[model samples]
Target chain A: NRTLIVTTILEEPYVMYRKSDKPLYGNDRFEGYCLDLLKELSNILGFLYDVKLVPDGKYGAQNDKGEWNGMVKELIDHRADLAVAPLTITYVREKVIDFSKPFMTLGISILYRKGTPIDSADDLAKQTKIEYGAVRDGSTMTFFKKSKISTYEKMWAFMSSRQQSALVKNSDEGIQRVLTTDYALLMESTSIEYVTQRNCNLTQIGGLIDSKGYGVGTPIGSPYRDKITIAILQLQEEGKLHMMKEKWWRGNGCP
Target chain B: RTLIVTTILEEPYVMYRKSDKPLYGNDRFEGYCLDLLKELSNILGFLYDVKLVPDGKYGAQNDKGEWNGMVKELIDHRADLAVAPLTITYVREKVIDFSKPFMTLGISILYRKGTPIDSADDLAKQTKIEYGAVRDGSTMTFFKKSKISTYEKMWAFMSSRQQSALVKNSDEGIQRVLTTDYALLMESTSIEYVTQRNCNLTQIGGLIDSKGYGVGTPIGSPYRDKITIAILQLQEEGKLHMMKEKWWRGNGCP
Candidate 1:
């Protein structure tokens, strides 16, 4: 059996390092929804697999000059055989790489302190009392680049503007900011759900602002696309996909 | 052609009378959208049959990719037009077309009297109180999209083994805020109307996100051009603004 190289990120509920005092190795070192999915796919596809985390921990998107970064670049450069994480499937990314049928669907949402008076982006825009932030070079930032709506455009401008400096290096920092300050973090609905479930002091506000899906990505025209898609479809048909999601996303930490 | 218009029973937008006088036909309703639809029919020379959406929802897409409420009514051709306070969103625009926005508003927080919540940040930091928004509405969509605190996050809190926080409509959400340690995320316009009548309820903080309401039609509909022109005429003539004041502010709630 051929050993396939799978790339993932260290996002909550998707992929993460297990907390252990003992020295962990190989697949045993990781535990998350994506790792479980990777194991199932390997079992169905009849292949050995090696898991590696993305060096930059980015989902991937292009810069202003049209340069690629993060896990997507790894795929495009042919360094990784597959990308399995909470990477959003957007039109811009679709142009450079191919994706399997969506494994999970999510939307944009806000993360704020439980008693923060803010309710929506409109509220944030009209007042300065509360500050808002999104991860720099994250999918939430990419959403603004692709959206044509005036409200989102204004939102992107407000986030990227120098006065706010609201852009953070990662979602963890963004979450920390929300925990301590009058701040809101724009992130994926799935992540927000997982975070709020685990952290009682943090709560999500309002409803989804937009909807999208996360897909297993491969370099464009990869020979493995058909086989990967078939395994995913089979898992979906047999309810394994749903079952695994419930196992990982709603794990024992939440009330 | 007689058009079928689907809408919701929202106060100051589309309301039925409480009189036991037994009114019939169009006389049974009065409000902003009702008056706007009447004006459109008069200008475009078309008769319209107004009906409330069976589900009483504004509109939202479910996991199965099917839209519910008035939006679905328009997409399935069950109604020729949807005249309500339906916000024009990127998701809805993909399936249906909209006339130029007739009204513009923003999302807001609705809390019961004596609540300390003043901004979304404040609400986010506390653990004692819960919050909710109308299912299948723009406010919900805003939460899902903004990803600050998403619809799914709120859903997890509501559906978690610990608590039940989801509500079916703005009225239910408002009622929850009134009776329990909860807040309602809703449109500023509707909040204004609701708080006017219910002094114990009030809006906290500023607007969340700005959006507009437009008359909805199926994509590639023949009436879009004519309807848009009539709407523009009303706006240019200042009649739309006049009608809004006549219906929305006429009640004198202060």
Candidate 2:
């Protein structure tokens, strides 16, 4: 029986190393929404997988020369059989990897401090007092760079012209900036909800700027692509996907 | 460039307005398609001229192996875009480009609520109750080409009695379901739309397959990416959800 190598990241709620007193190894070492998803896929397809945290700890993005990095490259280089991460399904990425039907829908949005006068992206773009940036080399950053829309183009120009590195290394760093300074983090809308729920001081500033989905990734032309897509649809139809999301996203109440 | 959008008349997706006074041009139509097209145009700042598919079909190949209906318009460049409930498929993708799905759906059964049918297998195993899909539509093509045993068997049954089984459009198949002993294999988005309006009509079981309806443009057309971006934008703003509820919401039935 052939085994699959699934690539992932250590994002909270999606994939995380377990905080257990007992020593854990291999699959037992990690738990989160993506691990649950992998288990469900394994049940339907009757396959075995090894969850490998991506080597570089990046979600993958393109450089100026068009080379890919992070989990995307792992799949492209055939180092991983699948990528079970909170990978955004974008136009550029779809060109490289085969994505199953999105199990979760999300979009780019602004996460800012609570009680700020800001209401939307335009408010931030129009004012320079509160600096805003997205996760560096992430889908959020790529969107602003690639977007031809006039408003987004101007925003991208603003993000690039900053004195300091406006881009944070990852979402955690961006969220840290949001909490510490007069800053806003442009990131995936779903993750924004997860943060704002636990930390009442943080909130989503605007509706999503764009809509896309988070999908399981496989190498292009892999046989598992369609089968996994069907399995996701089955989970969706049965409402299991919704149940799973509620399980991970529900947290203590914020007054 | 001013884009010409080709669409078919299907209630909720596209339909003729019951205007007391005669309406002209794009004003004559209203439904999900018009709203989506208008939003996309506004976002991109492009002008769109709406036209109904002349053949009144959703683009499929004829027995002669030539394309017809709205898809043909794209292939021939008679239309610049198609903003309707056109399913994205491997075959269609070869001829035209599709934006990411505006809505996700799958094949499902539309039948009377108090019926013996509960799933696709139930309809496949029995001969007493008749079941079919839109003539030459994607749902029928799925069964026709499926290697899965249950669907393969059902396709044979329909093939044997094409005249009685196949219907020209969703509306015709829907009318037959309400009037006779029949079940229509249709897409879930439309199935949800119909079942809500007429409480007696219910979706028998879970979806049979998964796919999406997208905005279509000619292969290699530059408009594909831009339209896709706007579709995503609309979805993010919850405008698409708002539009869906505006058209598909219905009253409760006893």
RMSD of 1: 13.5
Maximum-lDDT candidate: 2
Interface RMSD, all candidates in order, equals 16.3, 8.0
Task: Report the lDDT tens digits of candidate 1 across residue range A154-186.
Answer: 777778888548888888899889888888898
Off by over 4 Å in 2: B1-7, B11-83, B86-100, B103-212, B215-254
Q: For candidate 2, report its TM-score.
A: 0.62
DockQ (CA atoms), all models? 0.02, 0.11
Q: Which candidate comes out best when scored by TM-score?
A: 2
lDDT of 2 by residue, B112-229 (tens): 8787678999998888988898877788888887767888899999888545798878888999999999999999988888888898799999988767888888876788767776
TM-score of chain A of 1: 0.91
What is the DockQ score of candidate 1, to 2 decimals? 0.02
Q: What is the per-residue lDDT of model 2 for residues A15-111, given as tens digits with 9 covering 90 to 100?
A: 9999998899999999999999999999999999999999998888888799999999999999999999899887567778877768887778999
